[PDB]
């Protein structure tokens, strides 16, 4: 709450997780779920470096990550797939087109990538959006809620700062801010669909799912 906007941006950029490496129906979701499990470990470290997150209780930190984790995986996937029109870069060595797909989710991710490309989403905006997802997605499910909302306002300020610095008029800043936050509704939708898919995988007990991912489903 004392960081400048530029300080907020550099903190989030510094905390960015690395990009990790990874057909049959069983084997491909083996790859996706194995990848997602390894990314989750890095996500936990990243969340701890989102300013304000460590100020929350452990219980609240768990709840927020339990709600948001697939949304965060998914916006990351979209972000790194952005320069690959019509494909999803799950990993540098795992670049898929829609025919290889699931496809309902695949198409939603692709359309989000194309929207980011259409608006020329910037890396600095991306890291702000990912922190918003973390803090927002479970905040509705007193003093701790006000702290999350105060941090949320700070990231909004930081988004606006970035757009002003890029030369946007006030009207353009407000419009682009709204455009970005409305994409978060679509990300929530895709995470909801992806949880349901994950739940069907655990019921079919063919794809191996890590203890950690099994506990993330349980929370949903």
């Amino acid at each position: 709450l004392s960081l400048t906007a530029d300080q907020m941006v550099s903190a989030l950029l510094d905390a960015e997780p690395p990009i990790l490496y990874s057909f049959s129906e069983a084997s491909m979701m083996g790859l996706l779920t194995n990848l997602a499990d390894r990314e989750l470990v890095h996500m936990i470290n990243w969340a701890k470096r989102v300013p304000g997150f460590v100020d929350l209780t452990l219980h609240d930190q768990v709840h927020l990550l339990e709600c948001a984790w697939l949304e965060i995986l998914m916006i990351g996937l979209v972000w790194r797939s952005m320069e690959h029109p019509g494909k999803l870069l799950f990993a540098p060595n795992l670049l898929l087109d829609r025919n290889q797909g699931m496809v309902e989710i695949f198409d939603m991710l692709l359309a989000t990538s194309s929207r980011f490309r259409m608006m020329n989403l910037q890396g600095e905006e991306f890291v702000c959006l990912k922190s918003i997802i973390l803090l927002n997605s479970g905040v509705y499910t007193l003093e701790e809620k006000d702290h999350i909302h105060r941090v949320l306002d700070k990231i909004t300020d930081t988004l606006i700062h970035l757009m002003a610095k890029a030369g946007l008029t006030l009207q353009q800043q407000h419009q682009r801010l709204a455009q970005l936050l409305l994409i978060l509704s679509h990300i929530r939708h895709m995470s909801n669909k992806g949880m349901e898919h994950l739940y069907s995988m655990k019921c079919k007990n063919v794809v191996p799912l890590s203890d950690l991912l099994l506990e993330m489903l349980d929370a949903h």
């Binding site: 470990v41 936990i44 701890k48 452990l58 930190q61 768990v62 990550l65 950690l212």
Partner: peptide, 7 residues
Amino acid sequence: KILHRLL
């Protein structure tokens, strides 16, 4: 939970 110990 695992997430508890990881955090």
